[PDB]
Amino acid sequence: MIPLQHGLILAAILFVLGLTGLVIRRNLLFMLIGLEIMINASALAFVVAGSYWGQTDGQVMYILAISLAAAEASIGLALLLQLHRRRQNLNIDSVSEMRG
Amino acid sequence: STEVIAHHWAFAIFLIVAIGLCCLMLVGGWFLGGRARLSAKFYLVAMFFVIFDVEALYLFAWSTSIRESGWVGFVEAAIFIFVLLAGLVYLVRIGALDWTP
Amino acid sequence: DYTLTREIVTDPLNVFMGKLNDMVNWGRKNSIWPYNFGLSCCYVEMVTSFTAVHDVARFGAEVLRASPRQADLMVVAGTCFTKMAPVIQRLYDQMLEPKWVISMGACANSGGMYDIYSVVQGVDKFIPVDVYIPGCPPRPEAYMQALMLLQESIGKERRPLSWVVGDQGVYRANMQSERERKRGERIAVTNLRTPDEI
Amino acid sequence: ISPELIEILLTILKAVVILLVVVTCGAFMSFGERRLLGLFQNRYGPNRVGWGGSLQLVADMIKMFFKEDWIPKFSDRVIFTLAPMIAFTSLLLAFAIVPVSPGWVVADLNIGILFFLMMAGLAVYAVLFAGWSSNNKYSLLGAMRASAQTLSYEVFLGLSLMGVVAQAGSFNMTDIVNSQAHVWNVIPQFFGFITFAIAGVAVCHRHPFDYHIEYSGMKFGLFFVGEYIGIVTISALMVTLFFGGWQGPLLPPFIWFALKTAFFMMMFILIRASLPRPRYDQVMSFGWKICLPLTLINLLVTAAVILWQAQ
């Protein structure tokens, strides 16, 4: 007796909060944090969708979503470590050389 | 039901009493008594833990339904574990998992 | 006959608060955690006491913290060299109340045999000592006797129970000296075994 | 007064009794570790505070309570207070699934050992938070090394337990202890048993796999009581997963469970007293190169035998 609309609304709220955190923060670590929030919100939305229909498909795509999240966080933190190694700051506005 | 909701209430009381016990211990400790850059190896090992942990979750999901999946599922999980061990051999043989070079 | 620290005063001590203070003192004296601090040969006799043949563990004083925050007893067992005296002072400052000090050996008592340019003549020049142990080195059982002396000193001191109420001053009992207490039996000694025997 | 409410109150009281006993057993097994190290080291241990030293734990408890509560000035207060809280509650909730007797269980969850894995990850978080919040280079570096150890062994903790899970065909604890109704799982899952024992010693920061220097007062006591509660939890978990738990021929189920758990606690103390501490690189090489492929091959052979025996 939990509506599907409420779970989807909660997931959409978490997704837009993650997108806002991804946009308004120049720190690369906070952008990776925002990316984790958005992909976790997408996974939560899929879990809600699979639980409404009574199928394991939601949890299977949750598993695929968090496999992607783990590997993307790995690559993003490796790139963040490399950025901090070669330029000692995580401000991405310095990383803007290609333009036009 | 009755047994299930009783076990749920027991688990809730377990959580509440454990949290309250730790909080009360810290509060009693506070109130009583008078007064007067790391190397990349840590990132590498944590990343390896994350990747092999999600591959472990795949094996967790397989292991609880082995009999219902049959020999086909055994073949598929054998391919999965073979790719796991090939990745592990690749990591070991290139010195990624060696703490000292 | 007590001593105030923040003054020769009297005994301050509801009857429930006396029992509470007695229980606090009992728990403090029955669980004393020394600080692992290797200065000189006196520390070798201290860790000889900590081993199986003497077993200071029986008194509840075996924990031997390597961090000054956890420990509440400083056994200065060694010479107070001039380079290490600021180190000893900093380690004593890092300790938390209540804390007690035992000088072990003649070096920690007064400088001992080393009346020399590079040695501070006693740790009581800069650290308030609670129990002094003569010897060079004191034997392990002498360290355990001093531990028992510290225990009976702790067992009747008056400290505040909580820091939000009551008198926050620390009262240390003026114990009768061991020399005057043992003079009644030491003087009565007449004959000792001759040194030619085993 | 209704029988359903009476049953609810009885189950709540059962969980409260279980919680009080495991906390008391963790503290008294800190004391028992002191006494057992004394026994194994040709001495007595604490035997003067009360009869046989039985009041020693009260003495350290009073000393912990009436000490100066101290937080470093240039530290984070919230994380510093939070790390012992996690190190206590994580392994306490890990014990919250162990069935000590038929009918004496806190929560008969359908995840079970997955809940144990969640609690182990939170214990790793406790170690990391303790190291970061102390604002000390030594403690931070020690937490880095200890957390990399615990990651290198939590990488195969669950994979060691998957042999037992595969044989039982379930994640439930009671189903696992019922699957060993004839043979204990230490016989078929022997390699899973040794790998789980190694991983359980390693994730509990116990000898020979051992950031606490800035902690003092009741926080240090909370850290140590949480560590010994984790010892109790891991011992009871391996009793339930590999030694049948409460099943036995003659003794009552609690007598068998308590004897097996106390034997493994004594084995913890003997492992601490006996083995020397290996180096860091050899420990992590053993965790990655040896134990993880062993757990994978154990799971594969277990599945092959299970499917072969399913006629």
Next chain:
Amino acid sequence: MTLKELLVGFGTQVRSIWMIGLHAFAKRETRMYPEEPVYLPPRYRGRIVLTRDPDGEERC
């Protein structure tokens, strides 16, 4: 590492555990001060006294 080295190391760990257990089954070597008094040899160098002659006058 080598499998033979692993087996030899496991056997040696078991041997060390066995030796420590047999140490637990041995006699305690603790002298229980202060209930058990310390035996000191007659020429032990402890507290200093001034003595008397057989006539009872101080010998110094």
Next chain:
Amino acid sequence: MEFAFYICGLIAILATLRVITHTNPVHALLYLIISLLAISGVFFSLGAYFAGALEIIVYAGAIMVLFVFVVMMLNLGGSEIEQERQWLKPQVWIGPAILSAIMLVVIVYAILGVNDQGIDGTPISAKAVGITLFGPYVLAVELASMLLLAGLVVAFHVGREE
């Protein structure tokens, strides 16, 4: 399970809102771990027991362990950004706030117009998820192993020291 679902969702929303506005990286990671525990409680309220178990096992037990590892590797004490607090001034954050509010309004309007019979919350066990995972979803599992292998190789190649 209804009250648990709403309280866990409210806690997750509040913790995420604290995450996107906080300036301390470790405090932000702690609040996001709280949010991940809350979303796992949401999963357990809806009967997706395996999803919540993996949310604490992997998402709130492995990935942000890696995040906390990286943060303490960098020794991020709030330098050159905590001295700015640029995202707290209106001229940086109001624009994206209207952007996200408009997107949330559109998505909510789309959500409110769907057939909704409610979620019964019947517990879907991990056994059924494992049956479907190695039944109709075999190639998903194998190519997900290959995907994690690719991420492993990429992160090793980029995040070396030399």
